[PDB]
Design a protein around this ligand. Structure first.
Ligand code: HEM
Ligand code: ADM
Length: 405
């Protein structure tokens, strides 16, 4: 189900890629997408699926398209068009200089100094969840630690009910990983039927939570709108529940498989941070785009005002001209080049929380369960979307070999 090639597209620039169902998914999602970088693929190519759109395939274009906010605007950053358009999260769907102010607020809530505040609850929870799991010698990493871990921290952050979890999550999921049960605009609505009443309540009688600062936030001398609030808190929900959740499963499936990687981390912990960056470069997962405010010629391709362009942040680090032996994990690379936290004026704000949640889990799980592996006969399945994932990750271990701490 492909749409007619638009006039301006040289059919030799065609390359039918389906972000919602890449071919080789069975072999893995980063591998699925890494096709785009074979020798036989143009640096910039046009795909006819999800209604036809450019996709830039190399480290350097993405970096370039990202810094160039002018012809490449965030206005509509989600393929397909309707969602992108129907998406209004702030600061996301906004170019600077507008953005600068909405962003500075979000940075208030999730930023650096919020992260030192939270560290202990993080570690406290990291230990507590692991130790619970320990003695069973089998979890469901995705439902068992992956889902739980990060969410409860955000629920802690935003002061919202755990009970809410399963609902917002489905909503978050449909948004990044469209099933077909509900369209983006419908998705965006129910997440909004939710937040709204909450934002009301924090306007009248404030709290210390992320949302409380957000409803009461200051933007360009004036007091933030209700809508701008609904809209900021919307982004936090999704970035909240959706990126960290998935990343942990790929990193963990990776460890379940490479006992020399567990070993290395375990004996030379001065390496968790480097290890941390290398894993983000490799188990990268986001893929949104931009929009052409006008006609423009990018690396000789005539870009026509209105066209969408995917700029997968996945691809930047999996690119040979950037990372020798891209698909191979090496905690001692000299230079880890990636753009998992995006790039440009829209650099990811929760990079600190995300990183901090990732080191905690590596340091803590290796401490208690140094040795685990994939459940005999289980086939892991990934999912591609605006943010990619793992269907479930059954693990198994020998209690006898763990350690409480
Ligand atoms: C697994 C770790 C994470 C990854 C890979 C990730 C990925 C991304 C990427 C690629 C962007 C750039 C958007 C663009 O340029 O279109 C972004 C921005 C953003 N993310 Fe993260 N994210 C992660 C964790 C989080 C967390 C924990 C939060 C906080 C709940 C969060 C909230 C945000 C926000 C608010 C922005 C927008 C900043 C702006 O538009 O100036 N993300 N994220
Ligand atoms: C908005 C932006 C694109 C996708 C979905 C959501 C969180 C993060 C940044 C990845």
């Amino acid at each position: 189900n492909l749409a007619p090639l638009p006039p301006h597209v040289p059919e030799h620039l065609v390359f039918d890629f389906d972000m919602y169902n890449p071919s080789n998914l069975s072999a893995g999602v980063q591998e699925a997408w890494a096709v785009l970088q074979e020798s036989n693929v143009p640096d910039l190519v046009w795909t006819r699926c999800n209604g036809g759109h450019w996709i830039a395939t190399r480290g350097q274009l993405i970096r370039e398209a990202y810094e160039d906010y002018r012809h490449f605007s965030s206005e509509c950053p989600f393929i397909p068009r309707e969602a992108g358009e129907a998406y209004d999260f702030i600061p996301t769907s906004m170019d600077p200089p507008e953005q600068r102010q909405f962003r500075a607020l979000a940075n208030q809530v999730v930023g650096m100094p919020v992260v030192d505040k939270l560290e202990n609850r993080i570690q406290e929870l990291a230990c507590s969840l692991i130790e619970s799991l320990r003695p069973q010698g089998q979890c469901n990493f995705t439902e068992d630690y992956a889902e739980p871990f990060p969410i409860r921290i955000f629920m802690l952050l935003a002061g919202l009910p755990e009970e809410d979890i399963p609902h917002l999550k489905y909503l978050t999921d449909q948004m990044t990983r469209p099933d077909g049960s509900m369209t983006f605009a419908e998705a965006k609505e129910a997440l909004y039927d939710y937040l709204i009443p909450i934002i009301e309540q924090r306007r009248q009688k404030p709290g210390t939570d992320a949302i409380s600062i957000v409803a009461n936030g200051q933007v360009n001398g004036r007091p933030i709108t209700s809508d701008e609030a609904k809209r900021m808190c919307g982004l936090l929900l999704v970035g909240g529940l959706d990126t960290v959740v998935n990343f942990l499963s790929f990193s963990m499936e990776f460890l379940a498989k490479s006992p020399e990687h567990r070993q290395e981390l375990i004996e030379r912990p001065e390496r968790i941070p480097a290890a941390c960056e290398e894993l983000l470069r490799r188990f990268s997962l986001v893929a949104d785009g931009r929009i052409l405010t006008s006609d423009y010629e990018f690396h000789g391709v005539q870009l026509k005002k209105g066209d969408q362009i995917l700029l997968p942040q996945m691809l930047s680090g999996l690119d040979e001209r950037e990372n020798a032996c891209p698909m191979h994990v090496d905690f001692s690379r000299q230079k880890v080049s990636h753009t998992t936290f995006g790039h440009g004026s829209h650099l990811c704000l929760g990079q600190h929380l995300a990183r901090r949640e990732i080191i905690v889990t590596l340091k803590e799980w290796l401490t208690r369960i140094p040795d685990f592996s994939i459940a005999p006969g289980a086939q892991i399945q990934h999912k591609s979307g605006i943010v990619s994932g793992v269907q479930a990750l059954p693990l198994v271990w020998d209690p006898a070999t763990t350690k409480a701490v």
